């Protein structure tokens, strides 16, 4: 049911469908080292991708429904040059007729145009003044459906965002060749990332969009704050979804010391461009492989690892005493060689028992394989202290709403551009 599907291969991009679309790539197109299937496009003439379909699959009808889907990562817009700067990223218009998708300051726009020069635009808007954003510099699953009889709809991460009637539009012609390049961007340091571009000749409904989202989400692998793979030997800042205005901090080193949630977070401001909350605050968490037999650095589900903590550019270990008062027992950062027999092993969890993808969670267990419990935070005398407790597991068993057992790992990224 897919006509075009660009997928990475041995130093090339190959169409998975049985159509043999000819793909040519410019000399300045990049690939991520870990996730080479992600394609990076910069604001250069050479950083271009052309794909050519066949004459038997060119959209030239009036009653033909069709859908597109992809994953896009767009960095933060930093200065005033970027507003009112609509630039096309994917294009299929020839002789002023076709479909295109473009980006503006906090906007993703899908445009249809027929032989009668009638414009239909479906736009998704995300703000930049939010404290913590779900779309700024993070991977977004965009799916656009077109039923010529009823409507054109857009979907962000599988949920409907906007829809517009297109029954007035006439005959829509499509180019023999599809574009992948930044056109019309005045910013000379602006780039995007796209991956997993699929095309279908029918309008998808909610069920197909959703199960496509789960299929392409790679639920078996942990993800950081930016949506990339989680890796060992890389310092991550810690964010709590339940309490996003405080960062993990430590006061003392050893068993007598505890790690708690200290706030409030700072801010990064550019005077009506962005008012974001500082993400590089707190103590960095490093993940060290213990029992993972995989050769790559990618952190997968059910991996049993160790958690180093960086304090004053010195690496300590997460550990706690398995035998103390109460179930919610405090966590501590202690010296590497002096750990002895305190519990260190932590199991990383990404998807639930049923296989539904959720955020990153850590389940502390002892050396005997007994679950100490999920890691979260609890309030002791007006201090949010980090503790490992079985309460979250009990709530999960009862299908209740857990509070604070979900974490986010934020590595330093160029798309955020924050000063550390």
């Amino acid at each position: 049911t897919s006509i075009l599907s660009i997928v990475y291969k041995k130093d090339d991009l190959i169409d998975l469908s049985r159509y043999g679309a000819k793909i040519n790539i410019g000399d300045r197109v990049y690939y991520d080292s870990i996730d080479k299937n992600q394609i990076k496009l910069i604001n250069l003439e050479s950083s271009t991708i052309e794909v050519i379909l066949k004459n038997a699959i060119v959209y030239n009808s009036m009653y033909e429904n069709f859908s597109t889907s992809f994953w896009i990562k767009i960095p933060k817009y930093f200065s005033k040059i970027n507003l009112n700067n609509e630039y096309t990223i994917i294009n299929c218009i020839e002789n002023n007729s076709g479909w295109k998708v473009s980006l503006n300051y906090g906007e993703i726009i899908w445009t249809l145009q027929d032989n009668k020069q009638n414009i239909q635009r479906v736009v998704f808007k995300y703000s930049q003044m939010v404290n913590i954003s779900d779309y700024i510099n993070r991977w977004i699953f965009v799916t656009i459906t077109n039923n010529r009889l009823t409507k054109s709809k857009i979907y962000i991460n599988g949920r409907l965002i906007d829809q517009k009637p297109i029954s007035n539009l006439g005959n829509i012609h499509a180019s023999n060749k599809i574009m992948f390049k930044l056109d019309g961007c005045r910013d000379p340091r602006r780039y995007i990332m796209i991956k997993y571009f699929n095309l279908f000749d029918k309008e998808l409904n909610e069920k197909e969009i959703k199960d496509l989202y789960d299929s392409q989400s790679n639920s078996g692998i942990l993800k950081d704050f930016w949506g990339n793979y989680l890796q060992y030997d890389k310092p991550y800042y810690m964010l709590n979804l339940f309490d996003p205005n405080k960062y993990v901090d430590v006061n003392n080193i050893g068993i007598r010391g505890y790690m708690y949630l200290k706030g409030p977070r700072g801010s990064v401001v550019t005077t009506n461009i962005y008012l974001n909350s500082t993400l590089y605050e707190g103590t960095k968490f490093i993940i060290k492989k213990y029992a993972s037999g995989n050769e790559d650095n990618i952190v997968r589900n059910n991996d049993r690892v160790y958690i180093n903590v960086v304090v004053k550019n010195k690496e300590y270990r997460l550990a706690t005493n398995a035998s103390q008062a109460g179930v919610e027992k405090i966590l501590s950062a202690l010296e590497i060689p002096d750990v002895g027999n305190l519990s260190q092993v932590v199991v990383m969890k990404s998807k639930d028992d049923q296989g539904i993808r959720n955020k990153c969670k850590m389940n502390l267990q002892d050396n005997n394989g007994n679950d100490i419990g999920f890691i979260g935070f609890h309030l002791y005398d007006n201090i949010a202290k980090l503790v490992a407790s079985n309460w979250y597991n009990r709530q999960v068993g009862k299908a209740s709403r857990t509070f604070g057992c979900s974490w986010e790992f934020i590595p330093v990224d160029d798309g955020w551009g924050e000063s550390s």
Binding site: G266, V269, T271, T278, N382, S419
Partner: protein, 592 residues
């Protein structure tokens, strides 16, 4: 029917006057004078607490505008409610009973407000304390009047106003000796802080407790007993007065010759009692507006309103004008540095009252600096670094910041007015109020002194009234002091410095006191004993409302011109004196 009641009331008043003349003046009268003087000193202290603690509470509670003014006016609103309430209740429950109730309410809520942390709770506590202390003046004056013979009534009643001035002096001294110790940081509870102004509030709530303690040992006034149909206890109280007086004199052998005193003939349950009390109080209030008392009540209303309006407006306007003059001098001493180009260098200083214009600082790290009323205008900051910066009344206007970091600074978003920040980071912002709160330092000291001076200004005139109340008359003293108050209001224009304002405030305070003493005695003597406290409380409620209006207007008139307050005060005082000159004369009459 009316004639018989009038004859009975007149004969009762005459017999009561004869009994009081027989008993004489002595130790009982002086003891009660001191007790009610403490009760009045509580009221005199109560009016200064919020004004003295506002500079510290504004920082300790993050008080903004439209909240300090309400805090100032809440005491007068509470007094306005309490005066009416307790004046209405005193004619049906008793002078001493209602005095104890109201004073206890004042002490309870003043003690509670000393530990309250929030603002709305502080407003509620202060309002209830003002309600408790509102009825001190009417009840005290009507209670002391009913133990005095006609020979010396104005003098002995005007001696009772020394304690208001004593209370003002006590409040000023306590504020001077307690508030300046800002180092006191007693900690009870992590989230709560105990500063010195709370200690000041406690010491200011002390005189109401002392007044209650002194009042426990005094008997009810016999006149209230006689009006309400109770003759045994009235006779017992009169006998106690006689025995105390004659034992003090030195003749503890004579016998109370009075045997019988003529008495006014008397003609769900909680709700019924409350409804009955409300109905009787409303009846007393309406009868106060009766055919016999309809001219008198209106003239008294006019005099009270006009004099309260003028006095309170002036007494609030004087400190505001002094503050405005000091601020004008401070702004006149401001230094200006137009333009400076600064290269890589660490910055250390503490700047006061400066304006730097057109600056250009490149890679400058400002470490550990205190800024007081320092303004940067038209400046450009590039790759700068602000650390341990603390600032008050400091603003960055028309400024551009590029790649700058604000680490451990209290430079909040309200200090950057019409400023552009590019790629700037705020880290570890210091705890502080969301908006400006201003700062008061050593300049509070003189303020206390000023208040003290004003209170001392009352000392001479009072004495003169106390030595001349029964020689000239209440009407003549009232008019001849209101005229001098108007003259001083006109003379107001001849002063533009702090010393001139202090002298003018002292002169006005020393001139208006005789008029206030005469007004108090006249409103005591002009009403019958079954409506005295109701009428006095209503007039005191009117006085507090006029005080609120005058305070609001005269605060709105600071820094604009000196003609509007002068015109308002002079007109109001002239109208009050004109209305007062038409009142009836009460000198040389039985308390009827």
């Amino acid at each position: 029917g009316e004639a018989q009641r009038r004859k009975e009331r007149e004969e009762l008043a005459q017999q009561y006057e004869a009994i009081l003349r027989e008993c004489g003046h002595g130790r009982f009268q002086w003891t009660l004078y001191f007790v009610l003087g403490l009760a009045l000193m509580a009221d005199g202290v109560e009016v200064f607490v919020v004004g003295f603690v506002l500079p510290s509470a504004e920082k300790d509670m993050c008080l903004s505008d439209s909240n300090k003014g309400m805090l100032g006016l809440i005491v007068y609103l509470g007094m306005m409610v309490g005066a009416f309430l307790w004046g209405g209740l005193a004619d049906r429950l008793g002078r001493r009973q209602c005095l104890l109730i109201s004073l206890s309410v004042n002490s309870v809520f003043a003690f509670f407000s000393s530990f309250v942390q929030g603002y709305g709770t502080f407003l509620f506590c202060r309002l209830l304390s003002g309600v408790g202390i509102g009825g001190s003046i009417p009840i005290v004056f009507s209670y002391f009047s009913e133990f005095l013979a006609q020979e010396k009534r104005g003098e002995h009643l005007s001696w009772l106003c020394m304690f208001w001035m004593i209370g003002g002096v006590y409040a000023a001294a306590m504020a001077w000796a307690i508030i300046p110790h800002y180092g006191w940081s007693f900690q009870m509870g992590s989230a709560y802080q105990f500063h010195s102004w709370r200690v000041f509030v406690l010491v200011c709530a002390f005189p109401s407790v002392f007044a209650i303690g002194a009042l426990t040992t005094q008997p009810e006034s016999p006149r209230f007993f006689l009006e309400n149909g109770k003759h045994d206890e009235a006779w017992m109280v009169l006998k106690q007065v006689h025995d105390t007086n004659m034992r003090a004199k030195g003749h503890p052998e004579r016998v109370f010759s009075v045997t019988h005193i003529k008495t006014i003939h008397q003609e769900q349950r909680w709700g019924v009692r409350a409804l009955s009390l409300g109905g009787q109080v409303w009846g007393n209030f309406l009868s106060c507006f009766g055919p016999e008392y309809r001219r008198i009540t209106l003239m008294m209303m006019g005099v009270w309103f006009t004099m309260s309006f003028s006095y309170y407006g002036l007494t609030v306007w004087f400190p505001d004008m002094i503050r405005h003059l000091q601020a004008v001098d401070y702004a006149s001493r401001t230094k200006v540095f137009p333009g400076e180009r600064v290269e890589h260098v660490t910055f250390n200083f503490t700047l006061e009252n400066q304006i730097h214009r057109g600056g250009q600082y490149f890679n400058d790290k400002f470490i550990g600096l205190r800024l007081k009323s320092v303004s940067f205008e038209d400046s450009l900051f590039e790759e700068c670094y602000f650390e341990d910066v603390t600032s008050s009344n400091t603003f960055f206007r028309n400024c551009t910041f590029i790649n700058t970091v604000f680490y451990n600074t209290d430079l909040f978003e309200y200090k950057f007015v019409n400023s552009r920040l590019i790629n700037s980071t705020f880290l570890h912002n210091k705890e502080g109020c969301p908006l400006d709160v201003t700062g008061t330092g050593e300049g509070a000291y003189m303020v206390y002194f000023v208040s003290f001076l004003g209170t001392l200004a009352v000392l001479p005139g009072n004495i003169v009234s106390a030595l001349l109340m029964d020689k000239i008359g209440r009407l003549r003293m009232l008019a001849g002091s209101s005229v001098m108050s108007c003259v001083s209001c006109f003379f107001l224009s001849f002063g533009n410095s702090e010393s001139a304002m202090i002298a003018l405030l002292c002169l006005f305070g020393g001139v208006s006191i005789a008029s206030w003493n005469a007004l108090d005695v006249l409103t005591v003597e002009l009403y019958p004993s079954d409506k005295r406290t109701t009428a006095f409380g209503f007039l005191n409620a009117l006085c507090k409302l006029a005080a609120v209006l005058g305070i609001s207007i005269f605060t709105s008139f600071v820094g604009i011109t000196k003609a509007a307050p002068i015109l308002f005060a002079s007109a109001a005082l002239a109208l009050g004196s004109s209305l007062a000159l038409k009142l009836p004369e009460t000198r040389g009459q039985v308390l009827q």
